[PDB]
Symmetry: D2
């Protein structure tokens, strides 16, 4: 239902770029490029979305993951975003995210950052 609405290039408030294709079957595949952190260039992402969302004005739930390893750098971390796609003139993906770093067991208390990203098509 939102396959066409989701597919494409999105940008967040940090200036990061998310390029995604939504599959008819609920798949999300693409690339992510972060404007911040221990990252450079594009990184693979994968995820899932609700391909048959409610028809009552609700958003479409979705999520995706990036492991922060590519040919340039390995940040020994992974971020997951969970959120919803809200269609309309000013389409948005509103997300919250969890960034986990690989740690030793003694530091595991301090292993996960939490934040929020809002993506637009502009």
């Amino acid at each position: 239902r939102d396959e066409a609405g989701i597919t494409g290039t999105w940008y967040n408030q940090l200036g990061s770029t998310f390029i995604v294709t939504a599959g008819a079957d609920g798949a999300l595949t693409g690339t992510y490029e972060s404007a911040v952190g221990n990252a450079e260039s594009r990184y693979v992402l994968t995820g899932r979305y609700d391909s048959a969302p409610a028809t009552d004005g609700s958003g479409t739930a979705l999520g995706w993951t990036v492991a922060w390893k590519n040919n340039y750098r390995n940040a020994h971390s992974a971020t997951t975003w969970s959120g919803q796609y809200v269609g309309g003139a000013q389409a948005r993906i509103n997300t919250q995210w969890l960034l986990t770093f690989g740690t030793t067991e003694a530091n595991a208390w301090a292993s996960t950052l939490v934040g929020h990203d809002t993506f637009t098509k502009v």
Copy 2:
């Protein structure tokens, strides 16, 4: 590096079952079956992991997503887990998760649950 350690069947403290294959390239693919919530049977999951983790005793960062739609039910929601794989006699995936429900804009404040799951091989 942890491709063999991750691949297989894992169980969390709720009695949910995660069946995953880790790809050499950082992919995670599989199925999830929740012991709780608006769910039945298996659901597709996808995700990513750090395929070249630090060699200093750190865990391996990873994450994955499930959209809660399959042939039996559609919960109009998606969960992402972010965490790390810790190998050894008692291997564990320690995760935190974010479950987003599709909502209207007025209810979007209340759209995301947060929790934590710990997965073992037993």
Copy 3:
């Protein structure tokens, strides 16, 4: 240091109102009135802030809690906000929050909502 900057009336993006006094000693006391949810009128809040923050342009860490019981209603829940005060012409408190509901042990997986609020003086 930010005692005067914090003290006063703040409003978030939902239209909620936070009225706080910051003590020289790091205390926060006041009242919260939510524009949404199972709430009416004002509720007690308490919290803490860093009364000697870094002088390098960093924000001032702070947090506070509301238990959602007052003389009108009891929502059997509590929210904590964690964030930072950023002073300047357009002062802001940027927060993330965790709302826990009282649950049975079987439902405890689904006991905590996560979100984010941004408070301004206007």
Copy 4:
């Protein structure tokens, strides 16, 4: 209702110590000593709890904050815990927490850690 159950000394899985008094009116006051992180000795805490919880076996919602400044150290951070008290032979406070560090605006994306603590009386 749980004023007597909450009041006292609690310990988490890291070996941290939380000493709290619960007031009839919903207040929590006390001290926290962390076994980990940029902390030493005791730090003031304050918080709130549901003083009239549901009678159907549900837990009692509660939260509290610590700003990580005392006479020994100032970590320019604050943690909030949100959770519930579950009474009975093996009483527990099950919490999730948000730790915010003071940051510059450029680093604010990376300002908040998320975790979970479970407190017992032993």
